[PDB]
């Protein structure tokens, strides 16, 4: 119909929970979006799988309905290019010629490989693994899952050996189906497999040896984030025939592009159910001394030195707000904002909210949630505030660890997203204790945003990264530290003591 | 009007902190009638706590006169045979011996204006010699530091003590003085709560009075035994009571031991109310505590009798931990606490050291705070509520294990329990397990007025022997025996010990 010309960028965000499509214009407004859940298959405990075909069929459905919606509004709809971003680590093995999965996707959240990680960790110098791949052995990354498949599945062992299978992360799987055969990954995804030399950006021989990948040609070419990943040829999305796929990045790194985290000492934190952090380390490979992850932030082109990052997680810290709600200590999450406005301090109350142990730098799985310093005067308010403060303290320990390893004194910025960022009193406390400028982005959808940006740069939609930079840096709330260093030292040491009581062996 | 025949009764007066109660017991110890009246709890500035001695007296006369009218409007021949007095202890009044005017309000045991003096006097004296003399260290609760404060900030009180025309009395003395229009008496149990009595010889102490500026020892009432003739009622305020004998007198906590039939060594009572505190009968042995608990007099029936002794321990306002769960929405009603301990068999590793006001005896750590340990995302209101309740039991067990170690015994004969936490049977059962004791909950709520009726009736020979009353008094309404093996007790109390360690370790 009637409304004229419309040039768009398709950004696909294939998430854990669902599949999203965003149609961006070249000013980076969302002209249209939709999404579709897929089933989160948890068979026995610790298992977590996806139907790779369900995901693909959801994707086609979304692509086809989006373009009809756009074409029913505008006169000349042009989809210029396609950006792909995705749940990392999650792995599929399939048949190179029919494209049938030889098994479901095994999601990053899956832990059936826990016993193997223990075994292989007892046998190998985890220190040499960290130098090679940027991380110790773990249950999240793809390799131990690829291994489990090789060990409990004769067909997968055999078609890996004969060279007629493909081992792919979700991006590879998306691009292979859309282009009817192309076998690619990018640097950021490749870095989440346990198979890639973190220094040379190549599939690693010794790592594959460790993991029984006997034939290295089943692994897709590692491309850079901007690159030609092929043309759409699928007959499932007829309107998209011959449209170029031109950006590809893992979700967490995509959100760094959406948050314009481009230079060293620039960092982004998500405060959702999970609370985790990425610090851009410039062109320097920094290895952590406290067990945090060395990753690839991005590499735009083949000529570029890649930019590196450091990664840290405090698990599902935002679920401590759900736990206050279960125990009636608040009635609505919004009440947490209210409480931290009214309540200036906790009157000496400290909450070490280690419900699942303490993560980096301490690494203590045996730590539990502990509240200290209460009197008859203590109220829901004080306990709720302490919990929230306990989240900030954990986060500060990670920042103080990563910044110590990087040889810097302070973060340039911490760009923040997720639902806890609606709490401004809480944002302010994080700024105080960490000693950092905190900016909350203008955009919710920083993850799809980064893939659109990458895809648009590759086809030269904008004339330079600087053109997009100032668009991307728009903040919606800004925070500077209002706490003196003497008071920071005093509080974080009261925290340290409370963590000591929590951990001392008796 | 009044046609239901003959009625012989014992009057029991319970002059409490909060109010004044009258109980008319028959000689089967049924309550034929009771009534009561609040008096004002005066908290001027912080730490201060006073009563109007006249308001109390006037409440008492009002209750006495309305009770007897009620009885006389029902019965044909009402006979009030004797009167028993029990009372809030430690609370002190100084008055004029001849007019009976108070020279100042009563200063309630709960009052702490004397805190600086206790600190001073404690820096100066061997608190160890004080304990041997009086059964306790210096404190803000007992009468002497309040009598002292009065002497120091009040020239009239200093002067009329010096010249011999004033009386220093606990609430019993005050009651008996006004009722009999002049008699000046106390009993052994009240005397023991003044800081002025030799805990061994039952005499007012010279040296202790020296310490406290009681320059003239004749202002102190004669120490009587618990059964004794305290005088006849002569007051014209209660005309119907003229010439009725006052024949029992005891401090409230010791009266409850009499009502709970706590007569032999190794027999103990615990109250689980807002406050949670314990008394263990030590037989005829004066046992001094090695952990700062109080050596007191349980009772002495007659002048010929060797007194029976007790040990006393308090965990402060532990029952208020249940109010704190309610403020923080962790339960909706105290009754939900019983429900929770039925359903919830354990706390899945969760421990609550409920030290809201610090830890009392044996540890004595004012710097301890309330602390909760061992939680995961799976922890629920139930687990925290049960942990708190279990934390109360563990504190109590430390006190029992202290007192029993000083007494040279291995186990309590019984623990007779009262208060509203005793409606929670799963909680009573856990205390029985951890402390390792038989727990009996009495048939009677009103064990405090019960004891004074018993004492008054024995004095006038209403019953033929203490054994006559004993079996009546020992009626229980619930009984608990330990269902926990000693290996599990050792494992739990040692997990508790470690949690108290984390709470207290200095960093
Ligand atoms: N006003 C608030 N104050 C503190 N925490 C909040 C507030 N609102 C939401 N949260 C927490 O934020 C998380 C939800 O944020 P979101 O980013 O949508 O989660 P997810 O990462 O699961 O998508 C939950 O942990 C929730 O309890
Ligand atoms: N079912 C119960 N479980 C646990 N505690 C209870 C229960 N019912 C009442 N309580 C507590 O008992 C105390 C009240 O008992 P009571 O002996 O009447 O108090 P007080 O000593 O103030 O007169 C309060 O601490 C109250 O919260």
Automatic annotation (TrEMBL), chain B:
Pathway: Polyol metabolism; glycerol degradation via glycerol kinase pathway; sn-glycerol 3-phosphate from glycerol: step 1/1. SUPFAM superfamilies: Actin-like ATPase domain. Its EC number is 2.7.1.30. Residues 268-457 form the Carbohydrate kinase FGGY C-terminal domain. Residues 9-259 form the Carbohydrate kinase FGGY N-terminal domain. GO terms for cellular component: mitochondrion. GO terms for molecular function: ATP binding; glycerol kinase activity. Belongs to the FGGY kinase family. This is glycerol kinase. The lineage of its organism: Eukaryota, Sar, Alveolata, Apicomplexa, Aconoidasida.
